[PDB]
DNA sequence: CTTTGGGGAGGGGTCTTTTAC
DNA sequence: GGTAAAAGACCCCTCCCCAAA
């Protein structure tokens, strides 16, 4: 949509080129009344709030186990399924989570 | 020794909803 | 009443870090 002030970098987002250059400053305009913690973005600071209200909207369709956060609602299909989901295509070994997967290509030759 | 698994963080994209013109 | 930009809601990703395999 449009190009970055400072560091000349285009963002696809509609309307998302002020949050990106509102990083460059540094500051932490959200701040979690409670623990007095400050966020970088509104969002952030929403999911931290779940932490204290205790709220877990990611539900298990079978379990109905309830979960604060999307991804522990993933790993909780694995008990399930028993599948690692994340699969090297050229070691063929597997992985639970997809920054694992990228770890192993840059740290090692696959092979 | 290296590798794995998970917590917490920041950073971008898409869809929708609000808001300022 | 209409339009476009920003904010929201939620998604995805990787990185730093470190007990635990
Ligand atoms: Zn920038
Ligand atoms: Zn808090
Ligand atoms: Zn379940
Ligand atoms: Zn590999």
Same mark, same amino acid.
Do not use: W
């Given at each position: 949509? @449009?190009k970055c002030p400072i560091?000349?970098?285009?963002?696809?987002?509609?309307?998302?080129?002020?949050?990106?250059?509102?990083?460059?400053?540094? $500051?932490?305009?959200?701040?979690?009344?409670?623990? +007095?913690?400050?966020?970088?973005? @509104? *969002? %952030? #600071?929403?999911?931290?709030?779940?932490?204290?209200?205790? $709220?877990?909207?990611? #539900?298990? @369709? @079978?379990?109905?186990?309830?979960?604060?956060?999307?991804? *522990? #609602? %993933?790993?909780?299909?694995?008990?399930?399924?028993?599948?690692?989901?994340?699969?090297?295509?050229?070691?063929? +070994?597997?992985?639970?989570?997809?920054?694992? #997967?990228?770890?192993?290509? +840059?740290? *090692?030759?696959?092979?």
């Amino acid at each position: 949509f @449009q190009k970055c002030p400072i560091c000349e970098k285009v963002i696809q987002g509609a309307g998302k080129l002020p949050r990106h250059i509102r990083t460059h400053t540094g $500051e932490k305009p959200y701040e979690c009344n409670i623990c +007095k913690v400050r966020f970088t973005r @509104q *969002d %952030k #600071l929403k999911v931290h709030m779940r932490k204290h209200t205790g $709220e877990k909207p990611y #539900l298990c @369709q @079978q379990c109905g186990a309830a979960f604060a956060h999307n991804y *522990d #609602l %993933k790993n909780h299909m694995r008990v399930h399924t028993g599948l690692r989901p994340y699969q090297c295509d050229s070691c063929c +070994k597997t992985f639970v989570r997809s920054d694992h #997967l990228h770890r192993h290509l +840059k740290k *090692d030759g696959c092979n």
